[PDB]
Design a protein around this ligand. Sequence first.
Ligand SMILES: NC(=O)C1=CN([C@@H]2O[C@H](COP(=O)(O)OP(=O)(O)OC[C@H]3O[C@@H](n4cnc5c(N)ncnc54)[C@H](OP(=O)(O)O)[C@@H]3O)[C@@H](O)[C@H]2O)C=CC1
Ligand SMILES: NC(=O)C1=CN([C@@H]2O[C@H](COP(=O)(O)OP(=O)(O)OC[C@H]3O[C@@H](n4cnc5c(N)ncnc54)[C@H](OP(=O)(O)O)[C@@H]3O)[C@@H](O)[C@H]2O)C=CC1
Lengths: 348, 348
Amino acid sequence: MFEKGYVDENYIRVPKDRLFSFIVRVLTKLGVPEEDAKIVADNLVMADLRGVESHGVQRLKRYVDGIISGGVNLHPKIRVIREGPSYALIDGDEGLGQVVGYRSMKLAIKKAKDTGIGIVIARNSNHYGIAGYYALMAAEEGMIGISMTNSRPLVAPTGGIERILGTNPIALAAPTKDKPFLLDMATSVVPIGKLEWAINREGNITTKVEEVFNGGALLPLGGFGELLGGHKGYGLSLMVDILSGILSGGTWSKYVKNTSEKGSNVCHFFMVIDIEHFIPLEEFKEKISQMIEEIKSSRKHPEFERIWIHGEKGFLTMETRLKLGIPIYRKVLEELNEIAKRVGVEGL
Amino acid sequence: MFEKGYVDENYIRVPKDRLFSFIVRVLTKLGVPEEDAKIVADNLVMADLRGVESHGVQRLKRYVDGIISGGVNLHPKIRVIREGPSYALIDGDEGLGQVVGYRSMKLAIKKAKDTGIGIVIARNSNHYGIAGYYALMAAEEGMIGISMTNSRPLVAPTGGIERILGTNPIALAAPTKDKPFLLDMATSVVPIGKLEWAINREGNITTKVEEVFNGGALLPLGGFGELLGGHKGYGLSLMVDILSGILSGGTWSKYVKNTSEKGSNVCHFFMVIDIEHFIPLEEFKEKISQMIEEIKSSRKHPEFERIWIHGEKGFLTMETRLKLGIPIYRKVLEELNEIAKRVGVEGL
Ligand SMILES: NC(=O)C1=CN([C@@H]2O[C@H](COP(=O)(O)OP(=O)(O)OC[C@H]3O[C@@H](n4cnc5c(N)ncnc54)[C@H](OP(=O)(O)O)[C@@H]3O)[C@@H](O)[C@H]2O)C=CC1
Ligand SMILES: NC(=O)C1=CN([C@@H]2O[C@H](COP(=O)(O)OP(=O)(O)OC[C@H]3O[C@@H](n4cnc5c(N)ncnc54)[C@H](OP(=O)(O)O)[C@@H]3O)[C@@H](O)[C@H]2O)C=CC1
């Protein structure tokens, strides 16, 4: 069926349920409470299912190292710093990002349900995987969900060459008559996790392919200059840091550390709008689905086969891999079995 | 001094205060209440001062025609449809966009002040000028302001060629130790109002220069395809319509009519976050200004002179034109005097 990425011989199909239980085995063996392990697995598996290799199991080694080094708190006391009927400022106590984000989004949904609006911001957290995972939580509840997060410095501001801004993604999910609308994008042309594109910044600023890791930097949405809107992708990145890092009293991208480090201080932004408080949900669903249908049905470009709606490719890719299995690269699969050997659990 | 656009002989310096009083004369002569006329003038003049010609006085003829044709309600009964301590759904009753947006943002600021958060959405409104104008209102109050609006169909979705999406801008303003941070951008590479760029969509999809007006279409931030993130600018445009048009029970871009038409149904989104409810405002200002200083001071690209912060060029351009005067194109100035003659008031 349809699948977002290109899978060949260098890939091995792994039963979704198998990959999931594996992750849970490793995490619980390291002391992660079973329920928290299930949240992390759910988040990482969703990424693999939707075709986001960069944020799937390939990143399990990152969390494992963070747990072993004490850079990730196994029993975080996620505390509410400031709060109101429609908002809350949370301190993640260095817990897994998935756990901090899961609890933060659950609280935002609760507040929206009760007041119409829910805005929860968190600081002192860790990498939380795909932003769409949290936005979707609200959509599955019949509400609009928005999630953002800052990250390690990897992008250069317009007119500069240093890695100072994060890939800071933005995600919005809304319910429809069918599957939720789901926008989930890094504010840079591409995520660093992708490079296994367009973010061409070399030594002084060019491109290449491997000069990125060697003191290189990614480009913000819009591109290299100001001509094609590069300064806009740069602004969007700042919006994320202002709403996440600055407003929470946490920190911005430049100072976000790797997961293995204590005090990574990754910050997140969660916002939920209870559609029902505004207009009937069924009316909302009818109208948005009609918009989606009309957009898809609009005059296709000769070169193009189809006009997709955000989240569509991912849901189709998921559907496929659920009965066909999740394709995991060769070297990554080896990596996961080595992790299994190290911690002492059955591998894949 | 510094100025965002290029001004030559084809431009005439007009005292800011002079341009302002002119607009107010024309509008009040057409029956617009004096206070509402001052709001419109303030919004249009700010655009000219910040160097946004496309949304300044050059658009006075648009509002004039709408007023004369009944497409703009002179005495709108701006009504609250749904409301809560932290939100409100407003129906603009076809009033001037500036009036609807001004009252909507004032309400959002009030709710944020009292609860920490304020989200006001409006439907049945009209073109409201620059989005940054409303976001700035909140920043000048010591809060974070976010504003969005949908518009007439001018952009083609990724993989298509029809004008179906709006240029739907996004604006965020935050207070700093100095002048407010101000991001204000269309989600398309450029606004249609600019074409007097990068939005290359011709007859079937290419570029050119004049083929845009002739059945052409603008390109979404990211560009023509999917390779450089074109689908992201496309998603951002939808986010705006979902938060503005769909959620409000109004309508999305494809169905937004020109100002002169009754029922233009332009919709807006306003969001205010009272910083103080989260962290001390003075701490917020210190931290964001430190981030801005560090970004500007980062390693400059050889080709580039300076790294700007969003809103900086505009504020500098304004500063200049306030003591040097606002430069108005030749043909536009003629247009304004003709309007003055038609309505019967002193021109420029
Ligand atoms: N935790 C962190 O610090 C970071 C996490 N990330 C995450 O990594 C992932 C990488 O995202 P990124 O590469 O920027 O995004 P992509 O370019 O893959 O996708 C951008 C969005 O556009 C949609 N889309 C893709 N193609 C089309 C099309 N032809 N027409 C319409 N919509 C389309 C996608 O939906 P679909 O789902 O269908 O593909 C998606 O919502 C994200 O999930 C992001 O949240 C990124 C940076 C940092
Ligand atoms: N009412 C409507 O229906 C619509 C209104 N609009 C409005 O029209 C205007 C057109 O905006 P648009 O052309 O997209 O935006 P620009 O590309 O001019 O500006 C994008 C943003 O980036 C900032 N910026 C510009 N150059 C740099 C740089 N080198 N480094 C860092 N930041 C930079 C700007 O600040 P600065 O202020 O300093 O220039 C601005 O906030 C906006 O004000 C928008 O709100 C657009 C579409 C529709």
